[PDB]
Amino acid sequence: AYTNSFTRGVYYPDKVFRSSVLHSTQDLFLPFFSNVTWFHNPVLPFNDGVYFASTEKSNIIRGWIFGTTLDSKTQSLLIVNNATNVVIKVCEFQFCNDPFNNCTFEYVSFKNLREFVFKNYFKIYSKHTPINDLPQGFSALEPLVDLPIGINITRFQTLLAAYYVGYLQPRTFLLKYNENGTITDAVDCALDPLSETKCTLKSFTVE
Amino acid sequence: KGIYQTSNFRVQPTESIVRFPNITNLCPFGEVFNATRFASVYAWNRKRISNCVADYSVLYNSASFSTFKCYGVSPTKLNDLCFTNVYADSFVIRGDEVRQIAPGQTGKIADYNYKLPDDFTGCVIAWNSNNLDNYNYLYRLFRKSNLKPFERDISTFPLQSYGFQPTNVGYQPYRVVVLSFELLHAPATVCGPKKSTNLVKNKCVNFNFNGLTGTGVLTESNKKFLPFQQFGRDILDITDAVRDPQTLEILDITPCSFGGVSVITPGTNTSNQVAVLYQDVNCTEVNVFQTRAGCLIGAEHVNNSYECDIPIGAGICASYQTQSIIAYTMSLGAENSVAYSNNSIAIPTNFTISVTTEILPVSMTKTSVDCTMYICGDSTECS
Amino acid sequence: ENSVAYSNNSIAIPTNFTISVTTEILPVSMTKTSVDCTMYICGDSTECSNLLLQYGSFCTQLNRALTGIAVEQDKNTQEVFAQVKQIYKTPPIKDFGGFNFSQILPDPSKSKRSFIEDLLFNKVTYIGLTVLPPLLTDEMIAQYTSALLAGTITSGWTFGAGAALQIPFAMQMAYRFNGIGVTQNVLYENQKLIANQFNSAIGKIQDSLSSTASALGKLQDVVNQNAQALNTLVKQLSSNFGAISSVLNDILSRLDPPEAEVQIDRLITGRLQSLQTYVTQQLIRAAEIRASANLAATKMSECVLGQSKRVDFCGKGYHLMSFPQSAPHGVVFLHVTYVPAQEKNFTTAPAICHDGKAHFPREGVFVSNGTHWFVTQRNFYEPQIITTDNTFVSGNCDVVIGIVNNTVYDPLQ
Amino acid sequence: KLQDVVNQNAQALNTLVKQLSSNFGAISSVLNDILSRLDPPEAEVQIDRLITGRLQSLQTYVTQQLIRAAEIRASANLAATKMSECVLGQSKRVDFCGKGYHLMSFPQSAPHGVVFLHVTYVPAQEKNFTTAPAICHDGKAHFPREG
Amino acid sequence: KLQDVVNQNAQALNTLVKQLSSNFGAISSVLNDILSRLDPPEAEVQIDR
């Protein structure tokens, strides 16, 4: 099952304020109008970074596991958002075949769609907007945590009903920061020859 | 007679201001440089260091280090810098091999055990350990390709051991530490021990926030930073605002008042009195007059208008007259309402056969330059 | 395509005309930019300035070159607009024979610009890079154009040639017609129609300038080329050039002088080559704008202060007169041109026979409606009965190829 | 106009000769001192800084001269045009031939230039008259031919 | 005149292409030879010439 993620998954590239300006930036991003895999348990590739979104009714999805083989003899990131504490750690877990020691890091901190952008050292962005299945609308993601862990990672799994997975790719985006210093639009410079023109002219309007 | 741009004026900084975050815990460098065990180079150890204060003078002042070679900072500057991550890498190698631990080298160490980037920004710190540390220390010989910068590789036969017995000088075990400073544009977390000092507003000052140096007038601003943003950039990509690291307030940075200075003079055969124009500044930042070109000192303003003499700009001209220099809005010429009506004509009854000189350049002085004799005059070794 | 309906004996003569106002736009000056080469290359830094002195005059020569361009922008603007030795004014009574200049004369309710100048001024849109002001502010430019207007309207060309002399505006336009070989009776016998065509054509200038931003493209191009040159010049400050950073104050925070000088000399080398590129681009662009200022001054000398006989120099038509409007860093000419409009085909002959002697037209052409022979002006159909007053004798019939036998009236007979 | 063209050429050559004294980051700007002091393998590192600097200074001077020669050629073509139209003829181009109605011009030679004495009819003593576009004699209107 | 304009454009392109043979103080003007003969750290100093 696939869904067209229209213009979602733009995030602030750097911890720098800018306003009323069209900054052009190269980073891993979710490509515009990409197919996102709509799940309803399965261990997935990560490749470059995962955009993840859910219209979770009652906090049904709660967490993630990331690594290479999700067993001992390698390290694996765990995240659990248990409403008491955002538990994070990178232990060499001997996990089960389908879950729902030697630890080297630890940390604590319907209408809504939760969004995240997991990328590598390890960074998480977030946004949390009401809607009424991804919206034909636009909103930036803000950094949420930025945690140094030094982990080789290529696979992930999810802990618990819809969740949408998209894979990031290296791209150049042009981002319109408004007067309040928030991104109101973006252009994916790889999308089509019009977008290649919009980035060439550094403009959303091409004469 | 004329106006001459002579020099740039620039208001000087009144104070030095350093702001670093209010952290007081000394970094765990003793737990690296004085550690009892150092790892075998093929599986070189990494410890990251953050959220602490690092006195590099405690390292650098010791002669116990045989080398302290730094490749993107000079060691006397370290205590005034601040960094995101330090990344201390630690291992043992043969003493005569220590010269391979540098940006851009080739050899059994730099190609297959531990590679630094060709733009490594850090310090390599090394010492003899024959008084302490033997086949127990290992290195790689063979690989299918060279390893990437800061790659680490455990695999299986391609490993060998060193012969570090106490009777062996280049054959001795040298302990090596590399510090690999992350100069990233982010909230920094390892500063040198240099003291913070009180905030100063609306005065020109030499500022340093988290190691970002400059000079400017700090002013508190209504720029709506999101909680994660550390500093802001202008439309010209220069730093335009910053957040104070010891209290989260958004300070705009304005560069201290500057401008071209131009001197307005009659001919020196006529007088030595002159008037000074400070271009593009209000008359507060410097018998004083004000113009859209800048603040004008020593020329008196006049309500009459005359033909232009020395042009200032923005409709103002200056002259020397009954004496002082005066500045005035220039006359475009005498006013004349023409005596038009729907049945009036004026016809010349008499004429003048005036002669009027016009001068034009027609040629340049025909120069030829011998490019070989200009560049390499009388020299085979240069030619 | 058009096959023109030619023959050895067919001529097309226009029975009616259109007065058309064309707009012609020219740039006249650049922004008077002056870039402080020491602050651009070595911003606030002694340790950098002491290296830039190793390159000698390569700072001073760039201030010398940009000062040369900056004075030339006032020289260009002076040579285009300041061609009038006095500031003329129009009378309170606007009795200009029906021509309605109220769209282009100053409005006293307003800087004292005209109506069409406000369309023009609305339609065009920190680190050593200072901008100097023009010598003439836009109010003073708008007062020289008011003097050129009040000269041209009340006094024709004569305010360029000598003292300004009043002449009634209908009698000026009768000379403007006489200067294109259209006889004065073609003006007064059509005066209200000519005034209405001028007033309507002036009306279309407002709608043309108001409707599209593209009309001022030449001036917005000159603004944009300068803004792209400064955006380039400032983006080049952020380039590494092969140094460890572009932030000069950081290099000096990180390195001791024996090391720092090897890095800073790469930024000085790159920024200096960037500045020499920008100053070269500006010198070539200043030569282009000088050629446009000399062209604008030439059009204002010949086409405003006179009536240029130079075909298509003053917009597409037989030229009458021009009204200059100020525009931001430029000038605009409303060229007013007679364009002929409603031709009829006539039979023609190069000469006519009457008594074996041949007669030729003094001014004009011979034509026939198909049954009677007439002589006419060559740029407006007006048949005169042929006489020894409109025609002169030469030779005899036998030499002229295509002559026709005819009768010529003798006014004395 | 002529004196400033001579001054601009003199300033350009004086700048070009002064740049031979500039270090450009070598140990000396006197080329023979470098060659007196050093063996070729080390001297090449110094001399190539002077070659890079002097060549950039020559490329600057030649670019300045090419741009200046386009201004002097535009001036020569304008002088040739005034000599074609204003000396060899009588121009009807208002204010092309000095401020007046044009009669004739006499050229004079001058150092690296030309001078025209333009001779012009400028009218001087006007009187005000009542005027009319035409006059009526016999129900017919009459208009002036050459007046 | 036209033959001079065609000649100047051809001479400018010929000069620009001959400048690819020039060393500018590098050990060779052949970019693939400095890349195949030199260690990457030394190669950057030759390529940057």
Beta bridge partner(s), residue B18? B208
Question: What count of CB pairs under 8 Å joins C to D?
Answer: 97
Q: Which residues of B touch E40 (CB under 8 A)?
A: 104, 118
Distance CA C9, CA C351 (A): 11
Contact between chain C and chain B (3 or more Cβ pairs less than 8 Å apart)? yes
Contact between chains at A143 and B228 (C-beta distance less than 8 A)? yes
Which residues are within 8 A (CB) of A3 and not within 5 positions of it... i.e. 6 or more apart?
Answer: A35, A36, A38, A133, A134, A164
How long, in residues, is chain D?
A: 147
Q: Which long-range contacts (CB under 8 A, 24 or more apart) does C101-104 make?
A: C101/C149, C101/C153, C101/C323, C103/C202, C103/C203, C103/C205, C103/C206, C104/C149, C104/C202, C104/C323, C104/C325, C104/C334
Is residue A132 packed enough to be buried (19+ CB in 10 Å), middle (13-18) or exposed (0-12)? exposed
Q: Which of B244, B246, B187 is nearest to B218 (CA)?
A: B244
Distance CA A65, CA A95 (A): 10
For residue C133, give the nearest of B258, B292, B308 by CB distance: B292
Backbone interruptions in chain C following residues (C to N > 2.5 Å)? 110, 125
Contact between chains at B374 and D116 (C-beta distance less than 8 A)? no
Distance CA C123, CA C117 (A): 10
Q: Are A90 and A105 within 8 A, CB to CB?
A: yes
Distance CA B109, CA D61 (A): 52
Q: Which residues of B touch D1 (CB under 8 A)?
A: 359-361
How long, in residues, is chain A?
A: 207
Contact between chains at E39 and B103 (C-beta distance less than 8 A)? no
- Tokens representing C167 are 């002449």
Q: Which residues of E touch B71 (CB under 8 A)?
A: none
Residue C54 sits at the chain D interface (C-beta within 8 Å): yes
For residue D124, give the nearest of B351, B371, B374 by CB distance: B351
Is residue B170 packed enough to be buried (19+ CB in 10 Å), middle (13-18) or exposed (0-12)? exposed
**Amino acid, res. C254:** R
Listed in sequence order, the DSSP H helices in C133-184 are 138-155, 158-161, 169-178
CA-nearest residue to B236 within chain A is A21
Q: Are A115 and A126 within 8 A, CB to CB?
A: yes
For residue C255, give the nearest of B77, B208, B342 by CB distance: B77
Distance CA B312, CA B3 (A): 8
Beta bridge partner(s), residue B26? B53
Q: Which residues of D touch B338 (CB under 8 A)?
A: none
- Tokens representing A196 are 């290649």
Q: Which of C103, C3, C44, C41 is nearest to C249 (CA)?
A: C44
Contact between chains at B187 and A143 (C-beta distance less than 8 A)? no
Q: Which residues of B touch E41 (CB under 8 A)?
A: 103-105, 118
Containing C203, the helix (H) or strand (E) segment is: helix C191-211
Q: Are A77 and A204 within 8 A, CB to CB?
A: no
The sheet with strand B52-53 has its strands ordered as B52-53, B190-191, B82-83
Give the resolution to one decimal, in Å: 3.3
- R_g over Cα of chain B: 36
User: Can you give chain B as a three-state secondary structure string?
Assistant: CEEEEEEEEECCCCEEEEECCCCCCECCCHHHHCCCCCCEHHHCEEECCCCEECCHHHHHCCCCCCEEEECCCCHHHHHHCEECCCCEEEEEEEHHHHHHCCCCCCCHHHHHCCCCCCCCCCEEEEEECCCCCCCCCEEECCCCCCCCCCCCCCCCCCEEECCCCCCCCCCCEEEEEEECCCCCCCCCCEECCCCCCCCCCCCEEEEEECCEEEEEEEEECCCCCCCCCCEEECCCCCEEEEECCCCCCEEEEECCCEEEEEEEECCCCCCCCCEEEEECCCCCCCCEEECCCEEEECCEECCCCCCCCEEEECCEEEEEECCEEEEEECCCCCEEECCCCCCEEEEECCEEEEEEEEEEECCCCCCCCCHHHHHHCCCCCCC
Contact between chains at D67 and C170 (C-beta distance less than 8 A)? no
Q: Which residues of B231-267 are buried (b: 16+ CB within 10 A; e: fewer)?
A: bbbeebbbbbbbbbbeeeebbbbbbbbbbbbbebbbe
Beta bridge partner(s), residue B40? B92
Contact between chains at B336 and C162 (C-beta distance less than 8 A)? no
User: Can you give chain A as a three-state secondary structure string?
Assistant: CEEEECCCCCECCCCEECCCEEEEEEEEECCCCEEEEEECCCCEECCCEEEEEECCCCCCCCEEEEECCCCCCCCCEEEEECCCCEEEECCCCCCCCCCCCCCCCEECCCCEEEEEEEECCCEEEEEEEECCCCCCCCCCEEEEEECCCCCCCCEEEEECCCEEEEECEEEEEEEEECCCCCEEEEEECCCCHHHHHHHHCCCCCCC
Distance CA B127, CA B95 (A): 8
Q: Are C245 and C210 within 8 A, CB to CB?
A: no
Contact between chains at A15 and B230 (C-beta distance less than 8 A)? yes
Coil, helix or strand at residue D102: strand
Tell me which method was used to determine the 3D structure: cryo-EM
Q: Are A12 and A141 within 8 A, CB to CB?
A: yes
Containing C359, the helix (H) or strand (E) segment is: strand C358-361
Containing C333, the helix (H) or strand (E) segment is: strand C330-340
Contact between chains at B225 and A16 (C-beta distance less than 8 A)? no
Residue D91 sits at the chain C interface (C-beta within 8 Å): no
Is residue C1 packed enough to be buried (19+ CB in 10 Å), middle (13-18) or exposed (0-12)? exposed
Distance CA C237, CA C252 (A): 16
Mutation site for B-interface testing, chosen from A11, A14, A16, A73 by largest number of B Cβ within 10 Å: A16
CA-nearest residue to C67 within chain B is B5
Coil, helix or strand at residue D41: helix
Mutation site for C-interface testing, chosen from D95, D102, D142 by largest number of C Cβ within 10 Å: D95
Question: What count of CB pairs under 8 Å joins B to C?
Answer: 144
Mutation site for D-interface testing, chosen from C53, C54, C190, C262 by largest number of D Cβ within 10 Å: C54
- Tokens representing A67 are 């690594």
CA-nearest residue to E38 within chain B is B106
Distance CA C270, CA D45 (A): 19
Q: Which residues of B touch E38 (CB under 8 A)?
A: none
Distance CA A150, CA A160 (A): 26
Distance CA D92, CA D90 (A): 7
Distance CA D113, CA D109 (A): 7
Contact between chains at B364 and D116 (C-beta distance less than 8 A)? no
CA angle C26, C29, C35 (to 5 degrees): 150
Chain position carrying tokens 């060779």: E28
Question: Which chains share 3+ C-beta pairs under 8 angstroms with E?
Answer: B
- Tokens representing B40 are 């075998």
Q: Are C185 and C89 within 8 A, CB to CB?
A: no
- Tokens representing C123 are 């339609």
Distance CA C130, CA C67 (A): 12
Q: Which residues of C touch D67 (CB under 8 A)?
A: 280, 283-284, 287
Could you tell me the CA-to-CA distances from A193 to A136, A172, A174, A188, A199 in Å, in that order? 21, 14, 14, 11, 10
**Amino acid, res. E13:** L
φ and ψ at B262, to 5 degrees?
Answer: -125, 140
For residue A16, give the nearest of B48, B224, B229 by CB distance: B229
Contact between chains at A17 and B241 (C-beta distance less than 8 A)? yes
- Tokens representing B161 are 């051991």
Distance CA C83, CA C147 (A): 10
Report the C-alpha dihedral over residues D118, D124, D128, D132, rounded to 10 degrees: -20
How many other C-beta atoms lie within 10 A of the C-beta of residue C237?
21
CA-nearest residue to C238 within chain B is B237
- Tokens representing B241 are 């605002």
CA of B337 vs chain D CAs: smallest distance (Å): 15
DSSP string, C41-106: HHTT-HHHHHHHGGGGGGTHHHHHHHHHHHHHHHHHHHHHHTT-SSEEE--SS--STT--GGGTS-
Q: Which of C3, C1, C8 is nearest to C349 (CA)?
A: C8
Distance CA B42, CA B109 (A): 9
Coil, helix or strand at residue C401: coil
What is the dotted CATH code of the domain comprising A2-207? 2.60.120.960
CA angle C48, C49, C55 (to 5 degrees): 100
Q: Are D13 and B374 within 8 A, CB to CB?
A: no
Q: Which residues of E touch B103 (CB under 8 A)?
A: 41
Residue B238 sits at the chain A interface (C-beta within 8 Å): no
CA of C54 vs chain D CAs: smallest distance (Å): 5
Beta bridge partner(s), residue A109? none
Q: Which of A194, A50, A55, A190 is nearest to A135 (CA)?
A: A55
Could you tell me the CA-to-CA distances from A65 to A45, A77, A78, A79, B122 in Å, in that order? 12, 6, 5, 6, 34
Contact between chains at B226 and A17 (C-beta distance less than 8 A)? yes
CA angle A65, A69, A73 (to 5 degrees): 110
Q: Which residues of D touch B381 (CB under 8 A)?
A: 35, 40, 43, 47
Contact between chain E and chain A (3 or more Cβ pairs less than 8 Å apart)? no
CA-nearest residue to C94 within chain B is B341
Contact between chains at B106 and E39 (C-beta distance less than 8 A)? yes
